[model samples]
Target: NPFQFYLTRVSGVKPKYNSGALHIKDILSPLFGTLVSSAQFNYCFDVDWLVKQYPPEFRKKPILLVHGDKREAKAHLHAQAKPYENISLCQAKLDIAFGTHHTKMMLLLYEEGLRVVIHTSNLIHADWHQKTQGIWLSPLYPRIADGTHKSGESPTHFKADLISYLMAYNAPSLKEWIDVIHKHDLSETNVYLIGSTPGRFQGSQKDNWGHFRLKKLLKDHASSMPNAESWPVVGQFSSVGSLGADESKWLCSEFKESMLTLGKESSSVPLYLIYPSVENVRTSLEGYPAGGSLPYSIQTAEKQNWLHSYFHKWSAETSGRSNAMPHIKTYMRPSPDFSKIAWFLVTSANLSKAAWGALEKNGTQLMIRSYELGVLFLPSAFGLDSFKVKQKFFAGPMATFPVPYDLPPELYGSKDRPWIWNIPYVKAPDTHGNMWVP
Candidate 1:
């Protein structure tokens, strides 16, 4: 289930994620044996809760904590972390207007290599006990040649670009994490980093982050099918910020333009937007309360009525989260038939201009306002022979992306309305017999 979205644990009264879904501990425990002896560089909203998730046998080890809510750190964060001398907090400086320290990443150092875990949940308890999220587990990157801390070995730019993203923080934890990354041989990773940082970028640097970065990655390295125009692009997420009044503005134009892999017709490729409807949450395992994590607002949706045309319901019967309501955000380019996928991405970013980036100026500058991170899966990085079957690249027999939702997504019915947190729903009682009062 490589690249699959792992559903967090749900209450027994609700659905049990029986559709072959996994838990956070399941993936983290692979290195759990070594975790007690290792240091972790993790970023999230609640650090104390995350540390508690580890086994009691695994006591104190050094932890580099990164959280972005700097405005009220003293009020809510400091007291929580004061007891642990082993914990060092580094806030992700989130003063740039609407930006957030929303990227969820974990750097677990092991003797052989490092495990980079990029995921969707906050460190808060609720995010783990409920909600649908995505966790991307990277294969342990072995120590470089010389049988020591290593690098200078990479099948992709995973190591190099990772170091670049880390350096942006300019915080204390970076000093050690940088050394670990440099020493590791990330030769086994075939995924590309598609992510963002706050600030204005110029020249060639503009394409390194945000939607432009994704565009550069695809145009330069992504492979496409022979009939690429038919390959549909899907964006499934928990929240959506304003994407302008029309699709042609950002959603279907520049942003879509950035995702065209080689051989794509460069025309308007098919697009599908996966979001939960009001009924989807009302009937969910957690009932209407499940909509708490889904923050799409009525005002934003009203501004973009055209978006409804591309809407698709969230349905993952196989993964058993059709009603869980997405907290995970994903972008995928799959063969129209659903047999294979050309590329896949899971990120902290939803469909927002702030998270993915919005263009400013004469198109030479890019503006982004969030700490978003994701991995881009391409076929070539999997050690596939480029000559004989390069263009035929797809994720199927080699490694299948555990797609969160069923394909050929069930289109929104005439009465199905997108869920918005600000709106209340009482049309019917939820699974828990609750009604949203927002």
Candidate 2:
């Protein structure tokens, strides 16, 4: 008889040697017995470093490197190493002109079963060694018995949505890969597949995949008890792109409208944006060298005053994973007492018109750029009526479920401030080199 297995897991990574830096092999080798990864970028140096950690026998197997349009020379060299081959590269076709193959996923096929991993990290030294990242691992389901029917439907609707997202590639190059994914029995996973495909989707069929889809999903799956309005919503992300200036047209406006279900008495729900302060980055494990890119312009800051008010510094030390710099993007609506979470999302989508899409002139269409995907987890998905109980109550069966940073998220102090991307252009010249001021 084939072995039977039941498992579901979720984990966060800070990517520091001392702290919980979940190495790619640590998760992959155990279940899949070999390592394969796909990302937007690739660096051979890091790829070699990771491959060396695996057992000698497994070392012979190449770590498949799948990436988008541009091919790097180093990736090719590493693939043909003499003693133990390091990687094999596969370039996915770019379907949309400006859209990229940005999905970060891994596919593993072994004797026991197949496993899929969706995560947020570039396959580079900095992303793996110094930044904050997240990973979602699916349970290892054994190969089904002969004559057993494998259904596509699931409670979380993960299977159908995932297939839909993959089909969006519409590239002949991905046909075989998609075919393999379809063969897997993905009926048991509890994850909502939120994805973005590049297109001008308008009218009644506007592709509701990114932030908008998230809003729609919350409306359908989540429920809040009384006084839930007093709770705050938090968004933590690495990149910040152009969000238009008008209050009604602002990205934040759309975000709130999509994510929140406010009480009748509440005019608006309190929201917060968590980002690393310039100080925080400078003091991080790798310091400024390890810092990720900051893209928002000075004009963006001057125009969006509301954004300024909501900014909060991410405290690495307080979270105990001080060395891990955040590249992980997460959204949460926590109960007022911190006992429960209405909903939570960990995604590759960032705060940008490109990642989330923009409403067109007709008011019906959303013009999306690039491709992104994520998973949404609600309390209902776990068979828990509500997440209002204490953290300890979730210790045994639901131990891996994520909790908030703190009961009440810390706000920026008088000196603590948000890291503005356009500090040089917006702020007065600083002779002492202390230029980043809110």
Evaluate all candidate structures by whole-model CA lDDT and list the values in order: 0.73, 0.60
Error of 1 at 195 (Å): 1.4
Worst 10 residues of 2 by lDDT: 1-10
**What is the alpha-carbon lDDT of model 1 when measured against the actual structure?**
0.73
lDDT of 2 by residue, 1-438 (tens): 010111111134322322333466565554455433222222223455555556555665545555554556534544543334445555544555555556677666556666767777765555666565777777764556658777645798787777777676665535555665566677778778788777777755464677677766776777657766587787888767667665467554676667675323223678878877666665665555444354455566666766656667765443444445577777878777656677667777777777777777766777777778777877677776555533421122342344424455567676765555555322332223333343
Task: Give all TM-scores, in the order shown.
Answer: 0.89, 0.79
Stretches of candidate 2 off by over 4 Å are 1-21, 30-64, 70-100, 145-147, 262-266, 293-306, 316-319, 388-400, 420-438
- For model 1, residues 178-256, the per-residue Cα lDDT tens digits are 8877877776766798778888888988989998888777766766656788878888988888999798789888777
Q: Could you tell me which residue pairs clash in candidate 1?
A: 144-150, 150-183
Q: How much is the lDDT of residue 115 in candidate 1?
A: 80
Candidate 2 TM-score over all chains jointly: 0.79
Best by lDDT: 1
User: Model 1 off-target regions past 4 Å?
Assistant: 1-21, 27-33, 36-44, 144-152, 263-266, 383-398
